Symmetry: C2
Subunit: 415 residues, 2 copies
Amino acid sequence: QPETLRRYRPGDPPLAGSLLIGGSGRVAEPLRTALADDYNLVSNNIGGRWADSFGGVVFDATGITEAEGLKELYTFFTPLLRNLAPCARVVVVGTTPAEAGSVHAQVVQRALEGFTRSLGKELRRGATVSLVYLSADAKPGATGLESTMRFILSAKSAYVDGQVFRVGAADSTPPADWDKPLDGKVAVVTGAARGIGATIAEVFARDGATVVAIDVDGAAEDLKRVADKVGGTALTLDVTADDAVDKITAHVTEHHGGKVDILVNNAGITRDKLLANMDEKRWDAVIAVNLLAPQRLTEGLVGNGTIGEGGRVIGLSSMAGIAGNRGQTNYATTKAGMIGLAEALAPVLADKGITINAVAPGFIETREVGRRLNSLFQGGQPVDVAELIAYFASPASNAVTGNTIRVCGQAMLGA
Amino acid sequence: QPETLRRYRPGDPPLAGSLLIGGSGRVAEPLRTALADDYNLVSNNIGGRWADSFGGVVFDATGITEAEGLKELYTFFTPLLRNLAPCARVVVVGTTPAEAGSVHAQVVQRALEGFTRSLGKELRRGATVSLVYLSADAKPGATGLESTMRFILSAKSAYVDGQVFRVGAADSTPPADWDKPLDGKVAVVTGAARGIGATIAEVFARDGATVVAIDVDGAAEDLKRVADKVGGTALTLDVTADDAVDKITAHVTEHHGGKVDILVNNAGITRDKLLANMDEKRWDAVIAVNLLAPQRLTEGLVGNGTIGEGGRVIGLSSMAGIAGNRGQTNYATTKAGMIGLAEALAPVLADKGITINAVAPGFIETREVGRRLNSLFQGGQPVDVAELIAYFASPASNAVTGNTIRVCGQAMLGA
Ligand code: NA
Ligand code: NA
């Protein structure tokens, strides 16, 4: 039966249970130091005794350099698995494979993904698995991966499962309050009148952001209701219009101190048709809204300084973007394009202190096959998507860029 | 209903139908020049008139640099799709996205994968789709992609669908005979007594190779029958043994002129167990056969010069390696490791004129859900796997390295 997944409410501790950190790499110790105040840490012991079930288990694999060393995955995990709490979080931390140094080390660091993806398909009771790579050039403190670990090791990551997080080398500063990580940040969310966009606005406001909710004139009434509820502002506009950048800039200047800290390119349309039956308007409309507009809003707002130091851009990709979908050559192109925008702009935007990432939702309740064909045996909720976006949006997520991460419950579907 | 897929027999022309090449990039013209003798080329025309159905359609997208330019995918393909033959081949050729130059060009070159993967899910009557990227540093002749195009544009690629081929910058020479591309080459195939390994031996011999069929002492009778049939030799050994490299070297010295041109690391075992129920022997046995042995055979045979200039190493990955599988934390680790071996060794082996790639089969007939959940609505055949391996093995495939390609009929399952 599907598990009722633990999700986040304000003030919640990160885990329902303890956090065991082990492995003999470069991350275990500094991670213990970073997380000690906020998590109830326990250690491995040969007696196999722990008062509580584990809410999280983290294995530091960054020290493994030879295939024989992979046996520690077995020796470490096999005795721990029976003590996992429902919705526990299992995480392996490795070194970015291309940065692992030796050929043999790169092989084993790459091999870790076969292990984690498999373990995701074995965990019980809503528990999830994650793989996090950390650059070999990260400082001993490993502060750059803290926001990633705190997202994974919480209820917020409920529907993120089987995935790979790639942290670079930069140092990070915690937010003033990890429970209100977006305090003071101004967040523009397109397509925010309803659906996932409205939930993104809600989660962002929960986390302390001031939300600029954007949608089309035609959705003005719904948009106003969202903006009012979340304590933000409503901005009606067509993201494809030449003056969209100007209008956003004017709006944040009038209401929000002249800055956009977080841009979520969530607006999107479909004009589904088999390519054999495609026409010009159905092709162009989809490319205009879903690819040209996010490219223009991102480049235009960076280009006039509205998005600057500390900026966070998150694009919505999709399963069609990764795996393709019948009748969606237009839509899938745009959603693969949103991955391309993150991959291409990441190095360019780095120089200005801006990150850009992509989120690909799976099956989200907004049919029975889409719903059950994932490790969690259920569809996701809009909040689950919003949480992953809020993770990338964190001021403490400056060392995370050019990533595409799915929020899919470890769906079977992929590439 | 599933299509009866066209497959290759000796002497067959590459396509059942014509080959239309279009698009206004750097590949269309030199590709026409290269393929003119062996393919019946036709061109696009505004009248929409062609005597024959298309056996292949190639679109050169290497010139597309802006999202507006993606509309040419629509304008080019939509009028052609109704003239495809059964089992036709549709190919888009782009520029390696990171090499595309501008941010906008990288975005659109990356976006091409959403288009191709989607079109694969629309094509009828066993037709397939492929995306090929060519390095921006390839010479105008584009000879480095010829073997890739000839593999795709043939019956050999029957069960390869939805995939991405990445060609670097090197120039290539055709084999003396494209119909016997492995003539004179010595190919070692592990796990060759039965199953896919025996079919790899058969296909290699068909293509002109002299096969060294390797399997365990216990499979000696079956191994001898394969070696006799294919005109090769049988070498019984345990690939995990310290002297495996020595024994292979001695064998090829005695029978095959002292060289191994092609190494196929196909031998593999499973010891399926949930990680919670894992034990040391089930972990170690799988790592030894499936990861340590291919690493050692490859590094040892390169290291004593048995594999040298012109060498081709192909590892067998698997769906478990890419997507994970319940009960296979050990096996999946090794199969992800086989991808790692290709990724890690590619740059090191480049200096010695050796390529290394990985093949990940899907559902191959050797159950009904695995069988039908792909674009071709059927399981694959061992020959289909062998054909993809033989493509990487081609002497003309020197510009293809560090690739992992699935042979899965565009299976739903992935990452
Ligand atoms: Na603590
Ligand atoms: Na011709």
